[PDB]
Amino acid sequence: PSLATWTKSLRDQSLEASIESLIFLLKRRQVTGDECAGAIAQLLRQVVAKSKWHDVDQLLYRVQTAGARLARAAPHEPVIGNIVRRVLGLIRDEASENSVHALRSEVMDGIEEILDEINQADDQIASFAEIQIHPGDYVLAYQPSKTVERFLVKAASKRRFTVILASLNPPAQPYAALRKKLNAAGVSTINLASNGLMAYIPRVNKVIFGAKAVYQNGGLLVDSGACIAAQAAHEYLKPVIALCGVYKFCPEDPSDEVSRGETTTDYIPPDLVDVYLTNLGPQTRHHLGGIYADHY
Amino acid sequence: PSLATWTKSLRDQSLEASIESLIFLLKRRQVTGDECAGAIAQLLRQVVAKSKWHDVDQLLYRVQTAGARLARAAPHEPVIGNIVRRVLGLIRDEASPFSVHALRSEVMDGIEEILDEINQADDQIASFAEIQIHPGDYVLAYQPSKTVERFLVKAASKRRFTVILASLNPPAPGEEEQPYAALRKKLNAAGVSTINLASNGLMAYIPRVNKVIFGAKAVYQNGGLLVDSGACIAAQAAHEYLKPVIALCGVYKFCPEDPSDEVSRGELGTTTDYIPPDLVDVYLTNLGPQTRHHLGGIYADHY
Amino acid sequence: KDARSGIPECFSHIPMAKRIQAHKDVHPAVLAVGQQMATFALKDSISRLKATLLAFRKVIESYETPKGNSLSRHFVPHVLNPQIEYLTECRPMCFAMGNAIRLLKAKVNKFDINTPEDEAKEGLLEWIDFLINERITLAEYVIARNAAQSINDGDTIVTYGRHRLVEKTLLRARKEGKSFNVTVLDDPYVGEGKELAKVLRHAGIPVLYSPNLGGLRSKVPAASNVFLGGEAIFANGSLHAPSGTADVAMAATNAGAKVIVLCETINFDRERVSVDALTYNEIDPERNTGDCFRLLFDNTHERYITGVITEI
Amino acid sequence: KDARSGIPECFSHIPMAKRIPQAHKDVHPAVLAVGQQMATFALKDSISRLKATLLAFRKVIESYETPKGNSLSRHFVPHVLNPQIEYLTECRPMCFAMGNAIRLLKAKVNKFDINTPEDEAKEGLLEWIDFLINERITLAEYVIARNAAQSINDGDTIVTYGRHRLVEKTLLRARKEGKSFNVTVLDDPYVGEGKELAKVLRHAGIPVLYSPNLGGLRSKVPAASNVFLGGEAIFANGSLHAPSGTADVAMAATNAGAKVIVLCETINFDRERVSVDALTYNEIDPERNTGDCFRLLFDNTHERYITGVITEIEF
């Protein structure tokens, strides 16, 4: 139903059972994309811990078979692939540095550092909120991700401003906990029950949303309907800010099909995005390319 | 000297003396905006009263001679020409077995109605202010003429909003007083927040404002504006951020032709600037909001 | 309580439909029609206009001038105006209603005391009939005609929500033997576009339906032609339309797709100019509150419109 | 209460020169001097500020003597360099050049170890300061001026805003190359430095048109014009941090169809920070702090309005 129990119990179950459970969770899709990255890292770490391997290439085979299965599980989230290849890169680096046990525990603790990097990514990003948001600002937060919500909260701790909450579809009320967790901080919130944001855009000062993925060209994978906000914002020259962790930075260009069409998720071309905010800092497209070199 | 005093002389003063006293007054540039138009009307009325005539043709001759002299006097105000041209039209449509006295008193009272239309154009325009300005709006009023100021004042009465005051040049060292103090206190009384910018160049502040408002000295057939200097920087800056640009102008300031290429360039005066029609989104008049295609028609009405 | 209260300050100036028994004497027709306006049974401006005109028509023929008075002095102040204001407090009037009313009162005050009652009343009546026939019915027929002739075989037509004129156009074009594809986009908060889709598929038109505006760039290609209807067109050339319209229009414009608006001349507002959606708008009666807020209409700049098709 | 009070809410976050409240701590006299000329606004160019600061720090370094117990790497940055830093920073908010140079300086300091002779550390730092001044500032200025100047040709009309050291030297060089051209100088009526630049150009023999303000801007920036602009810094996203009014001229030129060329040393390039609006990184005028009369020193010019950037880097 949820899986704090699974993370605690991940060690207890046979590796395969855990993998199947992870796949089921992915199919359900309940797990947060941000959370999704953490699960992949952890699952692969315990793969390394409990898999049958006796040389380095074996590691590469076992984490790629696992990672591939995990990739078929949730095609919608490409962060999985990134996490997998990052783990692989680490193993390769260890091999280059180069006996199974020492390698085992450096790979495992490397994965642990990936894990906690992922977990403090949100607050590290939120540290820039005070700079990006000014007093009296009007912020259109579209389908706010947990990254975005905590961004807005610590923006709220040191600034007084207004948040405009836009969602693609009506509830089958949204963001209640978030919106007066915001009013408590003294931030005004108005929740838009409109699909199509062209009417309200001139009144907001900037647009903020989380990204599920970032491609080489600067393209984004976002929630559906985020692109209408992005485009509407772009025509009125309102700054578009994407909140994304470095692990979500893809070394792949988008598929042509993805570029051509999305829905579940939508694609935003790089010309519609003015700022990428990451844990390492705010990065330009050129700088994005730069950290891609850093990341992989 | 005093505009009002010149008025007294006009009532009891010789026509020629009053003519070139109004001319000296125009060249000094003490007369501002709409008042100029009204003065022209008054003068033209007095022309008709004492204007050496026994048929319509010299009435037209002296109203055009005088009007030519006032037009030449102040090239920066083209409203003069407009007033003159309407006075002429007025004369020739009430030209048609009667004594001139009948014509003179009818032309003169026609000019009085020109005059009072000129005089309540501002309130008529301001009646649309509550509609154009919204609660919580941010309004960049650039170098506000009194037309703009009552627009804002009667906007203030029924709305809560913020006015940002921009001026082209810094206050003169002699004045030792920062500007629009009167406007700013009548605005603060109404509960309207005001910020006065000592900035040349408004690009930094434009994204934050919601709309730009300024008075126009003239409106041409093509939709071009003659404005105070530096209004164009506001208009363009706003245009790039897709901020609505609203020009406040009475129908009398509407010129019936496209601007001369000297005006279009910006060589006139330079105290005044030209704004091409693509930077102006709304023309607000006493009759209402008029837009580009519709302009050609109303210029026909005026003359 | 005050429905007006709780509206965010930015949107305070904006009018809202007040649900309303507890009314002044009014004609039964006007009562009915006004209350179908309150329920939002009729939200097309043309349907509202037509209903109002028929109601006013029966109001006119039931009217009998008091003895020792004139019809012209008596009718506008004591009879027509109560109907008008009742309607205004059932729901804020659309431009069509306002314009038609202004025209109607122009014809009432053309009248004089020496004008007998009998010819004046049916003067008003076939004035109403002429208005309905040539400014509404014939106008619709002609617009449908012209727009259907604009369509060519193999075209992909994109529309937003369900608009009466767009529907009549696509249907007419289909019965002319033309073959084309229609993409119907919808407001998930309204959802009428779905039933539009069902109608178009009943006639044999292939339809792709999207419940919302997500993935918009995908389904508004440069090759596509976008057909839109509205409530009115302002003097500066911008389109007053159901919310979400401007988004489709802009998306299409930046795709390179043609954006064609269909509109009757009765809906052109020469007098008023709007530069933003906030100047002339209406709040959703149920979503007035700050926790859940929605505006019924949006403004589409002339910038995003390729052409307008009318009867004229 | 305080000067900060009375600043409008939208602009609360923006820093302002509070000057000196003067009182001198254990700061170096050169640093003291430079700092109070920063307080006076005698030096308002980021490059002049940087260079003065570098000479001050240079004299701080060569007088510095390690305590016997302490090591130069361990003791100098915490107890010597930092006091200078905060005194200067509290004379006036630091421009990017100074910040960058400081971070580089301390980068070079922490490479140092306890087992390093102090003399070797000191003229390591000193030859670094000299190299920085010679190749980042002086030579850079020369090369930027030359290369930008060859872009100018006979019969051209050049437009510039205010007075910029790089622009002034570029135009002077261009005239000294025997080229004949026209310069239109636009000014901030609140600053008014352009007039002097205009006078200098006349002495140079270059005909020039002076405009005290940005009125009638459309008139004097034709599409044929080439506009040369200088600034204080360039952000990572490519936008120009410049004296107020710059973005206005840049846009006017851009939508006129005129080419916009920015002259800048690489020191001023900030690869870490991105600015999308003038409010993110700006400084308030100490005299125009009040709501009654308000002014911001800088504005942000989007890359949309920049045709090209010319720097010291030739290849």
Three-state SS for chain C is CCCCCCCCHHHCCCCECCCCCCCCCCCHHHHHHHHHHHCCCCCCHHHHHHHHHHHHHHHHHHCCCCCCCCHHHHHHHHHHHHHHHHHHHHCCCCHHHHHHHHHHHHHHHHCCCCCCHHHHHHHHHHHHHHHHHHHHHHHHHHHHHHHHHHCCCCCEEEEECCCHHHHHHHHHHHHCCCCCEEEEECCCCCCCHHHHHHHHHHCCCCEEEECCCCCHHHHCCCCCEEEEECCEEECCCCEEEECCHHHHHHHHHHHCCEEEEECCHHHEECCCCCCCCCCCCCECCCCCCCCCECECEEEECHHHCCEEECCC
- The 10 Å Cβ neighbour count of residue D171 is 28
Q: In angstroms, how far apart are the furthest CA atoms of chain B?
A: 67
Task: Choose among C12, C275, C276: nearest Cβ to B135.
Answer: C12
Beta-bridged to residue C240, according to DSSP, are C232, C299
Are A15 and A65 in contact by the 8 Å Cβ rule? The answer is no
DSSP, res A223:
E
Residues in D closer than 8 angstroms to A186, CB to CB, are none
Give the span between the Cα atoms of D32 and A190, in whole angstroms.
51
Strands C181-185 and C207-210, how do they pair? parallel
Provide φ and ψ at D28, rounded to 5°. -85, 145
Give the span between the Cα atoms of B40 and B84, in whole angstroms.
8
Type of residue numbered D238: G
| Minimal C-alpha gap between C1 and chain A (Å) | 21
DSSP, res A279:
T
- φ/ψ region of D39 (left if φ > 0, alpha if ψ in -120 to 50, else beta) reads alpha
Provide φ and ψ at C3, rounded to 5°. -60, -35
Q: In angstroms, how far apart are the furthest CA atoms of chain A?
A: 64
DSSP, res D147:
H
Do chain B and chain A touch with ≥3 beta carbon pairs under 8 Å?
yes
Contacts within 8 Å (CB) and 24+ apart, B296-299: B296/B221, B298/B251, B298/B254, B299/B221, B299/B254, B299/B255, B299/B256, B299/B257
Residue B173 structure tokens:
């060292």
The CATH number covering residue A94 comes to 1.20.120.420
Residues in B closer than 8 angstroms to A205, CB to CB, are 207-208
> A139 with A283, same domain?
yes
Type of residue numbered D304: R
For an interface test with A, the pick among B209, B211, B241 (most A C-beta atoms closer than 10 Å) comes out as B241
CB contact under 8 A, B134 and C13: yes
Residues in D closer than 8 angstroms to B236, CB to CB, are 217-218, 251-252, 255
Residues in C closer than 8 angstroms to B280, CB to CB, are none
DSSP, res D135:
I
CA-closest candidate to residue B32, choices B173, B176, B144: B144
Do chain D and chain C touch with ≥3 beta carbon pairs under 8 Å?
no
Residue B41 structure tokens:
């009307």
Give the span between the Cα atoms of D288 and D293, in whole angstroms.
5
> B176 with B197, same domain?
yes
Which residues, 6+ apart, have CB-to-CB distance to B126 below 8 Å?
Answer: B150, B151, B153, B154, B155
Residues in chain B: 303
> A170 with A47, same domain?
no
> B92 with B107, same domain?
yes
Give the span between the Cα atoms of B49 and B14, in whole angstroms.
11
Give the span between the Cα atoms of B224 and B80, in whole angstroms.
17
Distance of alpha carbon C81 from the chain centroid: 22
Give the span between the Cα atoms of B75 and B78, in whole angstroms.
6
Are B289 and B283 in contact by the 8 Å Cβ rule? The answer is yes
Give the span between the Cα atoms of A37 and A143, in whole angstroms.
19
CB contact under 8 A, B135 and C279: no
User: Is residue A220 helix, strand or coil?
Assistant: strand
Print the domain residue range for A150. Answer: 127-295
CA-closest candidate to residue D3, choices D291, D264, D297, D304: D291
CB contact under 8 A, A205 and B210: no
Helix H or strand E segment including A286? helix A285-295
Are B3 and B25 in contact by the 8 Å Cβ rule? The answer is yes
| Minimal C-alpha gap between D110 and chain A (Å) | 22
Residues in A closer than 8 angstroms to C8, CB to CB, are 190
Residues in B closer than 8 angstroms to A236, CB to CB, are 241-242
| Minimal C-alpha gap between C126 and chain B (Å) | 32
- The 10 Å Cβ neighbour count of residue D5 is 9
**How many contiguous H segments (helices) and E segments (strands) does chain D have?**
11, 9
Resolution in A: 3.0
DSSP, res A254:
P
The residue with tokens 């009309």 is D157
Task: Choose among D9, D276, D277: nearest Cβ to A135.
Answer: D9
CA-closest candidate to residue B183, choices B170, B166, B208, B198: B166
CB contact under 8 A, D278 and B230: no
Are C160 and C193 in contact by the 8 Å Cβ rule? The answer is yes
Which CATH number applies to D137-315: 3.90.105.10, 1.25.60.10, 1.10.3720.10, 3.40.50.10470? Answer: 3.40.50.10470
> B20 with B140, same domain?
no
CA-closest candidate to residue C273, choices D90, B291, D102, A263: B291
Angle between helices C164-175 and C138-150 (to 10 degrees): 60
D213 to chain B, any CB pair closer than 8 A? The answer is yes
Type of residue numbered D160: T
Number of domains in chain B: 2
User: Is residue D303 helix, strand or coil?
Assistant: helix
CA-closest candidate to residue D100, choices D74, D136, D144: D136
Residue A29 structure tokens:
């899709």
Contacts within 8 Å (CB) and 24+ apart, B233-236: B233/B201, B233/B202, B233/D214, B233/D215, B233/D217, B233/D248, B233/D252, B234/B140, B234/B142, B234/B166, B234/B202, B234/B206, B235/B275, B235/B279, B235/B280, B236/B279, B236/D217, B236/D218, B236/D251, B236/D252, B236/D255
Alpha helix (H) ranges present in D132-183?
139-151, 165-176
Beta-bridged to residue D158, according to DSSP, are D183, D226
> A30 with A84, same domain?
yes
- φ/ψ region of B43 (left if φ > 0, alpha if ψ in -120 to 50, else beta) reads alpha
Provide φ and ψ at D160, rounded to 5°. -135, 160
Angle between helices B231-240 and D246-256 (to 10 degrees): 70
User: Is residue D210 helix, strand or coil?
Assistant: strand
CA-closest candidate to residue D231, choices D90, D40, D46: D46
Residue B84 structure tokens:
């003159």
Which residues, 6+ apart, have CB-to-CB distance to C112 below 8 Å?
Answer: C70, C72
Residue D64 structure tokens:
């510095």
Select from A87, A104, A121 the last residue of a domain.
A121
- The 10 Å Cβ neighbour count of residue C130 is 10
Are C178 and C153 in contact by the 8 Å Cβ rule? The answer is yes
Give the span between the Cα atoms of B215 and B77, in whole angstroms.
13
Are D277 and D14 in contact by the 8 Å Cβ rule? The answer is no
Strand order through the sheet with C232-234:
C268-269, C232-234, C239-242, C297-300
Are B181 and B157 in contact by the 8 Å Cβ rule? The answer is no
**What is each CA distance from A184 to A19, A121, A189, A197, D167, in whole angstroms?**
41, 24, 11, 27, 52
Are D164 and D269 in contact by the 8 Å Cβ rule? The answer is no
Task: Choose among C272, C273, C278: nearest Cβ to B134.
Answer: C278
Strands D233-234 and D240-243, how do they pair? antiparallel
> A104 with A171, same domain?
no
> B81 with B146, same domain?
no
User: Is residue D300 helix, strand or coil?
Assistant: strand
CB contact under 8 A, C9 and B136: yes
With the C-alpha atoms ordered D202, D206, D207, D209, is the resulting torsion angle positive or negative? negative
Give the span between the Cα atoms of C97 and C30, in whole angstroms.
13
Helix H or strand E segment including D56? helix D46-63
Question: Is B11 exposed, middle or buried (CB count within 10 Å of its CB: 0-12, 13-18, 19+)?
Answer: exposed
Angle between helices B15-28 and B3-12 (to 10 degrees): 170
Residue A63 structure tokens:
């984490």
Type of residue numbered B79: V
Provide φ and ψ at C298, rounded to 5°. -140, 165
User: Is residue D269 helix, strand or coil?
Assistant: strand
> B111 with B147, same domain?
no
Give the span between the Cα atoms of A290 and A69, in whole angstroms.
30
Domain spans in chain D, listed from the N-terminal domain onward: 1-136, 137-315
User: Is residue D259 helix, strand or coil?
Assistant: strand
- The 10 Å Cβ neighbour count of residue D92 is 26
Give the span between the Cα atoms of B225 and A166, in whole angstroms.
40
Distance of alpha carbon A279 from the chain centroid: 11
DSSP, res A253:
P
D280 to chain A, any CB pair closer than 8 A? The answer is yes
Are A291 and A283 in contact by the 8 Å Cβ rule? The answer is yes
Select from A86, A106, A121 the last residue of a domain.
A121
Residue B32 structure tokens:
């501002």
SS3 letters for chain B?
CCHHHHHHHHHHCCHHHHHHHHHHHHHHCCCCCHHHHHHHHHHHHHHHHHCCCCCHHHHHHHHHHHHHHHHHHCCCCCHHHHHHHHHHHHHHHCCCCCCHHHHHHHHHHHHHHHHHHHHHHHHHHHCCHHHHCCCCCEEEEECCCHHHHHHHHHHHHHCCCEEEEECCCCCCCCCCCCCCHHHHHHHHHCCCEEEEECCCCCCCCHHHCCEEEEECCEECCCCCEEEECCHHHHHHHHHHCCCCEEEECCHHHECCCCCCHHHHHCCCCCCEEEECHHHCCEEECCCCEECHHHHHHHHHHHC
Helix H or strand E segment including D164? none
Provide φ and ψ at C79, rounded to 5°. -120, -55
Give the span between the Cα atoms of D311 and D315, in whole angstroms.
10
CATH class belonging to C136-312: alpha beta
Strands C297-300 and D182-186, how do they pair? unpaired
Select from B120, B139, B161 the last residue of a domain.
B120
DSSP, res D137:
I
SS3 letters for A138-206?
EEEEECCCHHHHHHHHHHHHHCCCEEEEECCCCCCCCCHHHHHHHHHCCCEEEEECCCCCCCCHHHCCE
The residue with tokens 């995990």 is A70
> B293 with B150, same domain?
yes
CB contact under 8 A, C235 and B159: no
Give the span between the Cα atoms of D154 and D160, in whole angstroms.
17
State the structure-solving technique: X-ray
- The 10 Å Cβ neighbour count of residue A123 is 13
Residue B104 structure tokens:
């003179």
**What is each CA distance from B135 to A17, A293, B138, C12, C244, in whole angstroms?**
60, 50, 9, 7, 24
Are A160 and A188 in contact by the 8 Å Cβ rule? The answer is no
CB contact under 8 A, A202 and B240: no
Beta-bridged to residue D228, according to DSSP, are D160, D261
User: Is residue A283 helix, strand or coil?
Assistant: strand
> B137 with B82, same domain?
no
